[PDB]
Amino acid sequence: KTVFHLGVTEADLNGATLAIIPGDPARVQKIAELMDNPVFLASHREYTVYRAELDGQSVVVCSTGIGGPSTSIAVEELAQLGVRTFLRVGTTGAIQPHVNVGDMIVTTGSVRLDGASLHFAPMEFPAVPDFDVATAMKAAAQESGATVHMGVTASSDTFYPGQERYDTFTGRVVRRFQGSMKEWQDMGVLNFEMESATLLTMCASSGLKAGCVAGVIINRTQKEIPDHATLKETEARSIKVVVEAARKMLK
Amino acid sequence: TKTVFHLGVTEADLNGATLAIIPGDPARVQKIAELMDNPVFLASHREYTVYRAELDGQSVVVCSTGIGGPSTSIAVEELAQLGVRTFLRVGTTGAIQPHVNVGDMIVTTGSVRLDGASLHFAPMEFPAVPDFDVATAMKAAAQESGATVHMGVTASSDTFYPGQERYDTFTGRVVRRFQGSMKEWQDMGVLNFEMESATLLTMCASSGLKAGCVAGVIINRTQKEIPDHATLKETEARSIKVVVEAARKMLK
Amino acid sequence: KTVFHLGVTEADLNGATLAIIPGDPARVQKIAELMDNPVFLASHREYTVYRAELDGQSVVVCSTGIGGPSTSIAVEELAQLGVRTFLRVGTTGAIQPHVNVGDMIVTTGSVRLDGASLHFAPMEFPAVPDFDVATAMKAAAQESGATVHMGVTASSDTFYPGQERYDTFTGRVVRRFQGSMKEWQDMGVLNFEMESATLLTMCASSGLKAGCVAGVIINRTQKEIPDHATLKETEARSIKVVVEAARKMLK
Amino acid sequence: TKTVFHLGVTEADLNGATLAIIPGDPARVQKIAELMDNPVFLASHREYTVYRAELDGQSVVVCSTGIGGPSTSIAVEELAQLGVRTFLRVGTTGAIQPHVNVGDMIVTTGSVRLDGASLHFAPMEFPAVPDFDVATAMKAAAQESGATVHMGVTASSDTFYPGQERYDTFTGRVVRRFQGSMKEWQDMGVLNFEMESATLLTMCASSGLKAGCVAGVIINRTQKEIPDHATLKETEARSIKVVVEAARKMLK
Amino acid sequence: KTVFHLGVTEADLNGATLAIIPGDPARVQKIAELMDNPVFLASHREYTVYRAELDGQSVVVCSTGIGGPSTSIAVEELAQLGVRTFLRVGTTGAIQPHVNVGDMIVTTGSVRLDGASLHFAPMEFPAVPDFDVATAMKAAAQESGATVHMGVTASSDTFYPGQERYDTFTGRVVRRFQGSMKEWQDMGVLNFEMESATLLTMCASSGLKAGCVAGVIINRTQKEIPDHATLKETEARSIKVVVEAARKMLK
Amino acid sequence: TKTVFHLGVTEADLNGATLAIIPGDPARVQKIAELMDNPVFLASHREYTVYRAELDGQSVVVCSTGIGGPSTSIAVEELAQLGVRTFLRVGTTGAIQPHVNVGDMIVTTGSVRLDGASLHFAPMEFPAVPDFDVATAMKAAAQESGATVHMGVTASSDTFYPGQERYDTFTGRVVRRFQGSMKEWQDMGVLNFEMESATLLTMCASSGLKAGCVAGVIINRTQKEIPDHATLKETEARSIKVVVEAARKMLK
Numbered sequence A, C, E: 001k002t003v004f005h006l007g008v009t010e011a012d013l014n015g016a017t018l019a020i021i022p023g024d025p026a027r028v029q030k031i032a033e034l035m036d037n038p039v040f041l042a043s044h045r046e047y048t049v050y051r052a053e054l055d056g057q058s059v060v061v062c063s064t065g066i067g068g069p070s071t072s073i074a075v076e077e078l079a080q081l082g083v084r085t086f087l088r089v090g091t092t093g094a095i096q097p098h099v100n101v102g103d104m105i106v107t108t109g110s111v112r113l114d115g116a117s118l119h120f121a122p123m124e125f126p127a128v129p130d131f132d133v134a135t136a137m138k139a140a141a142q143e144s145g146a147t148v149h150m151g152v153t154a155s156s157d158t159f160y161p162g163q164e165r166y167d168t169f170t171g172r173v174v175r176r177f178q179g180s181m182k183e184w185q186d187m188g189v190l191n192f193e194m195e196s197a198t199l200l201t202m203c204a205s206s207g208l209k210a211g212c213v214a215g216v217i218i219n220r221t222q223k224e225i226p227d228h229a230t231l232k233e234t235e236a237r238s239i240k241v242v243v244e245a246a247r248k249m250l251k
Numbered sequence B, D, F: 001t002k003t004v005f006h007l008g009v010t011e012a013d014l015n016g017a018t019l020a021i022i023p024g025d026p027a028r029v030q031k032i033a034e035l036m037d038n039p040v041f042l043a044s045h046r047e048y049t050v051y052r053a054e055l056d057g058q059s060v061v062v063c064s065t066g067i068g069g070p071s072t073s074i075a076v077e078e079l080a081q082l083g084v085r086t087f088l089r090v091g092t093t094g095a096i097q098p099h100v101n102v103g104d105m106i107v108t109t110g111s112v113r114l115d116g117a118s119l120h121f122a123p124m125e126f127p128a129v130p131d132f133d134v135a136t137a138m139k140a141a142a143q144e145s146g147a148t149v150h151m152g153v154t155a156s157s158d159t160f161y162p163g164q165e166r167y168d169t170f171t172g173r174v175v176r177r178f179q180g181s182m183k184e185w186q187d188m189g190v191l192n193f194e195m196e197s198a199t200l201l202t203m204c205a206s207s208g209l210k211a212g213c214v215a216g217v218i219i220n221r222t223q224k225e226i227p228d229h230a231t232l233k234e235t236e237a238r239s240i241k242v243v244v245e246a247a248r249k250m251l252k
C-alpha cells in the first residue's frame, strides 16, 4: 500500500497521473510552488515528494537522485501508484559549439552509456521519448523565449570518465571512453547527462510516457565562465518550461 | 559532373533537389513521382530507380533503396554526395500489436536495431531515432489525410524471416536470439517490423542528415505470417500520398 | 503456392534443385543464356528469376540484390521451392597486392561484418562454404585459364565505412572500422564484398550447399586503373565459370 | 585549494583523513560519525552528507553515496581528489541463500557486475574485488562482534526491481537477461543482492584505492517469515559498529 | 636458440616445414614410427617432439595437449622454427546420428566456443582450414576406405559444460550452453572437440596452413558402446590418414 | 564406484582426500607429494599425473593440470566427482609491475578473465575470485617461508603470446583487443600474467568448491619476454614448500 522507497500511498497522490521528476531534492519545492496548493508528502534518501494541482488536476513532483539506478526506483514506484507520464527537467553539459549556456535541449533520443537501461530492454532498443511529451516540451520551451535544440543526448553512468573528463585523481579514462567526446560531437550529439537513457528506455518499454528537457549550464567547448544572473535565469526558466509542458500534457 | 557510383545520376540531374523520397520497391518510384509535377525518369540500375519531380516549384528526387540496410546505405550516401539532406522513407510493415490494422500508417519514433549496417555508422548504444521535424511532418501528413496513424517504436530486422520470428519457412528454425522475440517486442510496446529504418535512422542521425520513416501496415502478425495480396494496392496508394504531403511540409 | 517476394511457384522451377545467384538483376539473363532453353519466370523488386537447363537438368538463376538482407529472402524462398544448392557469382575488391584485376577468388570462409548472418547462427559459427561447391568452383575457375585464389573474404553490410572508405559525404569511419582494412590485410584476407557472410552462414546452418566465386574488378592497393577490355573479359569469364561449376555439381 | 564539485568540502576540511566510511543513506552519516570522537558536520548537498570525526586520534571521513553506482562513483572520485585512499562501505543487503539469516553479516569477496558504472573504469573481464587488507579487517571486525559472518560473492545490480528478479511490479515482467537470474545466482553460491559494490570495488581496484563492503542482512528472498522490529534495529546498529571497528583495524 | 616450451632448436628439425600435431604426447612416437628414421627430440610438459622423414623430407611430430591454450604455444614455437604447415589429428565425438564410430571427419570450419582464437582474430573471423590441407586430408581419408564427412565442428574450451554434459559434479550447465547440443545438431554441426577453433583461427590469420582430421570415437546420440577392436582400428586409421595427408602436402 | 574419464582413478584411490594441490607441470607432482607422508603414484594419462599423500594424517591429492583453462577444467571437474572440495594451485607467473622481483610470490585476489573456459561456468559479470580462507592460508604460508609476497589482481590469458602482449613472435602482431593491454593492466594495478586462474577461480566459485592460486615470479616483463628454465629451479622449490604449508593450514 505504501511503496518501499518513496513513502507515499496512492491516496496521497489525489489521483495524479503525471509526475515532474527533477534530480535534486531541493528543486522539488521550487517546481511545486509554480502550481497550486503544493504540499510536502515525504522525504526519504534522495526522494522528496510533493503534490500540487495544475489546472485543477493533481501533479506529483518527485526527485530522482543522480543516476539511472535511483531514477529507476522512483519511476517504478510512482507507476505502481498510478503515474503514467514522467517529465524530467535537469541540467546538462553541451558538447556542441553552437549551443549556448541558457539554451534549452529537448532530448529526441539518448546514447545508452548507462547500465540500468539494460535491465528493461536490450541495447538494440532505442532510448527515445514519447512523441507527445517531446512535442509539448518543445512548444513550452519555445514559448518561454529560449533558444531550443532538439537532438541526441549522451547519457552516462559516470560524471567523470564516461564524460571523458581527465582532470581527476588518476587522470585516466578507460579504453572504451578514450576519444569518445569527439566521437559524439562528430555524430551530432548535443550534450551529456546521467539519467535520460534509463528513464527513456524504461518508460518506452513499459507503457509509460516520458521526456527530458534541460537547461545548458556549461559548454565543454567554451572554456569561459557563464554569467551568474544567466545561470539563475536558466534554472528558473527550466522549471517554468517543464510546468508549462505538463499543462500541455494534461489538456 | 561525374555520376555517383551506384545510382547513375549527377548533381545536375537532381535539378537542385535537397529532399529525397526513398521507397524500397523500384516500382513505387514512378508512382510517387507522378503524384508531383514534371516527373522525369533519371536512371535505373540494380535496385536503384531514380526520378525527379517538382513539388510546389521545388525539385524532389525519388530513389528506391532495395530491401535492407546495406542497399539503403548506398543510396543515402550517394544522394548526400549530390546535396540531398532530407530523406523520407515510405515502406510497408507488419504490425506486432493486435489493435494496429491493415491499412493503418505507422510513423517511427525510434527503431530497435536488429540490423548490421547501423553499426557501421554508430555503436549500438546510439539511438536509431528520426529527425524531429521529419517525424512531425509525417505525423501531420498522415493525420491530415484521415488515416489511422500510430507513433512509436519499430523493430528493424536484417531478415524478413527469422529476425521477424517467422516459422513458416524451409527449416522452421529460429535462432535462440529471436525465439520468443515477437512477444517480447509486443510486451515492450513495439508497433511493427520492417527492415530499413534502423540503418537509415542511425546513419542519418549520426551524419548530419534529416530522416524519418512512415509505413503502411500490410499484415497483422498476431494473425499470420504472409501478407495477403488483395490489400497491398490500396495500402500502398495511401502510403505514397502521405509521404508526398510530408515532403511538402518539409520544403523550404 | 507462389512465394511472396520472388513470385514463382515450385512447378515454375521444373524440378530445379540448384540456383545460380548473382547480385544484379541484369546479369540473370546473361547467365541463363549460357545454358539451354532459358525462360523468364518473374521480376519483382531486385529479384529477376529465370529457369534454364544444364546437361538436361533444370537450373534456376535468381538475382539477390545488394546485401545480406535481400539475399536471405531469395535463398529462403528458393529453398521453400526445393532448391538445395546455391552458387553465388559476384564482383570483388582485392586488398592483397598479389591478387591482380582479372584473377578469381573462391571464398573459403567469410569475416562476418554483416547483421543477417546473426539471424541464422551466433557469431561463433563459421561462415564457410560447402566443400563440394568450393571444390567445383576452384576447378571451373582453373579450367577457364584464370589465376585463382582460395581464401578468406571480408563481408560487409556497407560499401563505404565497412570497407574503410573515407571518400564519402562525412569522411568519417566509426571506431570499429578504423584501421580495419590493414588489419584484414595483415590477417591474409583477400577481398571485400557484401553478401557472402549471410549466404554462407544461412546455408551452412540450414542444410543447404553454398559457395561464392568472384572476379577481381579492383585492387585497393594498386594505383593503376584496369582497362575496359580486361574488365569485360573478367565479367564474361566469371559467369562462364559459375555455369561450369554448376555442371560439376549436377554430376 | 579547491572545493570539489559535488561534495562541498576542501582538503583542509578533512584534517588529513585518508580513510572514509561510505554508507548509502545520508541519514546514517551522523550516526556513524557519533560512534567516533569529536564528530563535525562538514556539508550536505543532494545525496552527499559529509562529516569528519576522530578514531584513535586520527581523522576519518564519513560520506554518504546515494543509491547506485553513478552517485557512488562521484563521491569516491571527489574524496580521492582530497586525499582519501581507503573506502569502507557499510550497507544493507538481501540474502538469496536459505542458510543466511536476517541479522547475519556479509563481507563481499567479489561482486557480480550487473551495473554500468564499473565499465567506465575497467572492461567486464576485470574482477570487482575488494582490497585484501580491507576485506580481512571487515571479516575480523564482523566476527569479533559475535555475528555470524559469511564471506562470498554479491550480485550488484543497477536496479532494485528487474535486476533483482522482482515481479511484484507495475509491469510484472523482467527482460530476458534477468529471467531466471536469481536461481542462477543461487545455484552459483551468490549470497546477496545490493546496488553499489560492483562500481565501488571495480573503480577502486583499478585506480589504486583500497575498498571493501560489509553489510547486515535485513531480508532473505527465500524466507516468508517477516523479521521483527527489534531484530532489524539490532542489525542496523551492529553494522555500523562493525564498520567503525574495521576502520580502526585499517588505521596505520 | 632453443624455444622455451618445446625445448628444440631450428637445427633439430633438419629443415622441416610441416608438422603433424596430435593432442596426446603418447601418440607422437606412434606417428613418427609410421615414417622413416624417427628421432626423439624432446619432451617437456604436454609437448613431446619427434622428427622423421617422409619421402626423403623432414617432418616434425609434436603433441599439443588438451585445449587451445597449450596448442597455441606449440604452433607459435614451431612457426618460430620454420614450420608453416600444421596437420592436426585428433579424436572427436559425433553429434549427428548419421556419423558412426570409426568414420573420419575433416573440419571445414569451427564454431569458436573457445577463448584463445580471440587472441588472434575477432569473433567475426572464420575458423577455417587452409583449402590445400583440407583437400589433402579428405583425399587421404577417402583413399583409406573410411567413411568421411566434411563439415562444421564445435570447438569447446571445456569437455563438460561446453559440450552440454550433465553427468557432472554439479549437474549444472550455464545458460549459454543449455540446449546448445540440439542447436548445433539442428545447424548441421558434425562433432565436438577442443582445439580446432584455436588452431584454425591462429593459422588462418597468421600466414600458416592448417587443417584438422579426426576419428570418431563416440557418438553422443548412440547408446551402444564401441568395442575395443573398433576403437583400435579407428586410432590406427587416423594416424595412417594424417601421414598420407602429409605426403600429399609435400609434393 | 566410477572411474573418471581422464584421470584414471576412483574415489577409493584417494583415501578420503578432500583437498588437492594442482600444479601445471606433471613433473612437479611427485616433487610436491614427496614433501608429504606416504606418497603413492596413482595414474598418469596425457598431462595428468596423479599422486596421493598424507599431510598431518589427512589424505591429499596432487594432480597436474597442464597448461591453460581447458585442461585445468577437466582435472578440477573429475577431482570434484571423486570428492575433492578444496583446490590449491601453484604455478609460475610473469610480473608486470616493475617493483616485483623474480623469486617473489603472488597470491591472486581476483583474476582478469582473458580466457574462454570461465564463460562455460559463469557469465563474464561473475568475479574470478578465490576462496577467502585459501587466499589467507596462501599469504600466511608465503610470508612464513621468508618470501616477498604480493596480494592482488592477476591477468589470466588463454595464450602465452598475444594475450600477454608478447611481440617477439613469428608474426610480431598482436590483435587489436590486446594492443596496449599490458600497459592498461599495469596502470590498473594488475600484478602479473598467467594462464589458469580465471578458469580455476570462476569454475570453483560458481560450483561450491574452494580454490586459490599462488605463483612464483619467473620473469619481470619490465625487462624481457622469455623466461629461462634456470631461474625456474630455485623459484620452484620455495613455491612447492609454500603450497604444502598452505594446504596444512587449510586442513587444520
Ligand SMILES: O=c1ccn([C@@H]2O[C@H](CO)[C@@H](O)[C@H]2O)c(=O)[nH]1
Residues within 6 Å of the ligand: A023, A065, A066, A067, A090, A091, A092, A093, A094, A159, A163, A192, A193, A194, A195, A217, A218, D006
Ligand atoms: O556536463 C554535465 C552537466 C550536467 N550533468 C548532470 O549533473 C548531475 C550531477 O551533478 C547529473 O545528475 C547530470 O544529469 C552532467 O552529468 N554533465
Ligand SMILES: O=c1ccn([C@@H]2O[C@H](CO)[C@@H](O)[C@H]2O)c(=O)[nH]1
Residues within 6 Å of the ligand: B024, B066, B067, B068, B091, B092, B093, B094, B095, B160, B164, B193, B194, B195, B196, B218, B219, C005
Ligand atoms: O511483415 C513485414 C511487411 C513488410 N516488411 C517490409 O517488406 C519489405 C520486403 O517485402 C522490406 O522492405 C520490409 O521493410 C517487413 O519487413 N515485414
Ligand SMILES: O=c1ccn([C@@H]2O[C@H](CO)[C@@H](O)[C@H]2O)c(=O)[nH]1
Residues within 6 Å of the ligand: B006, C023, C065, C066, C067, C090, C091, C092, C093, C094, C159, C163, C192, C193, C194, C195, C217, C218
Ligand atoms: O570492392 C568491392 C567490389 C565489389 N563489391 C560488390 O559490390 C556490390 C555493390 O556494388 C556488392 O554487392 C558487393 O558484392 C564490394 O562490395 N566491394
Ligand SMILES: O=c1ccn([C@@H]2O[C@H](CO)[C@@H](O)[C@H]2O)c(=O)[nH]1
Residues within 6 Å of the ligand: A005, D024, D066, D067, D068, D091, D092, D093, D094, D095, D160, D164, D193, D194, D195, D196, D219
Ligand atoms: O534486497 C536488497 C536489500 C538491500 N538493497 C539495498 O537497497 C538500497 C535501496 O533501498 C540499495 O542502495 C541497495 O544497496 C538492495 O538493493 N536489495
Ligand SMILES: O=c1ccn([C@@H]2O[C@H](CO)[C@@H](O)[C@H]2O)c(=O)[nH]1
Residues within 6 Å of the ligand: E023, E065, E066, E067, E090, E091, E092, E093, E094, E159, E163, E192, E193, E194, E195, E217, E218, F006
Ligand atoms: O566427445 C569428445 C571426443 C573427443 N574430444 C577430445 O577429447 C580430448 C580430451 O580427452 C580433447 O582434446 C578433445 O579434442 C572431445 O572433446 N569430445
Ligand SMILES: O=c1ccn([C@@H]2O[C@H](CO)[C@@H](O)[C@H]2O)c(=O)[nH]1
Residues within 6 Å of the ligand: E005, F024, F066, F067, F068, F091, F092, F093, F094, F095, F160, F164, F193, F194, F195, F196, F218, F219, F227
Ligand atoms: O610470463 C609468464 C610466466 C609464466 N606463465 C605460466 O607459464 C605456464 C606455461 O609455461 C602457464 O601455465 C602460465 O601460467 C605465464 O603465462 N606467463
Ligand SMILES: [Cl-]
Residues within 6 Å of the ligand: A022, A023, A024, A027, A089, A090, A091
Ligand atoms: Cl535537478
Ligand SMILES: [Cl-]
Residues within 6 Å of the ligand: A129, A130, A131, A132, B109, B151, B152
Ligand atoms: Cl511516441
Ligand SMILES: [Cl-]
Residues within 6 Å of the ligand: B023, B024, B025, B028, B090, B091, B092
Ligand atoms: Cl516499399
Ligand SMILES: [Cl-]
Residues within 6 Å of the ligand: D023, D024, D025, D028, D090, D091, D092
Ligand atoms: Cl546506508
Ligand SMILES: [Cl-]
Residues within 6 Å of the ligand: D130, D131, D132, D133, F109, F151, F152, F153
Ligand atoms: Cl588486494
Ligand SMILES: [Cl-]
Residues within 6 Å of the ligand: E022, E023, E024, E027, E089, E090, E091
Ligand atoms: Cl590425439
Ligand SMILES: [Mg+2]
Residues within 6 Å of the ligand: D131, D204, D205, D208, D209, D210, F152, F189
Ligand atoms: Mg588494489
Ligand code: NA
Residues within 6 Å of the ligand: A046, A064, A065, A066, A067, A070, D047, D065, D066, D067, D068, D071
Ligand atoms: Na543516487
Ligand code: NA
Residues within 6 Å of the ligand: B047, B065, B066, B067, B068, B071, C046, C064, C065, C066, C067, C070
Ligand atoms: Na537490396
Ligand code: NA
Residues within 6 Å of the ligand: E046, E064, E065, E066, E067, E070, F047, F065, F066, F067, F068, F071
Ligand atoms: Na593442456
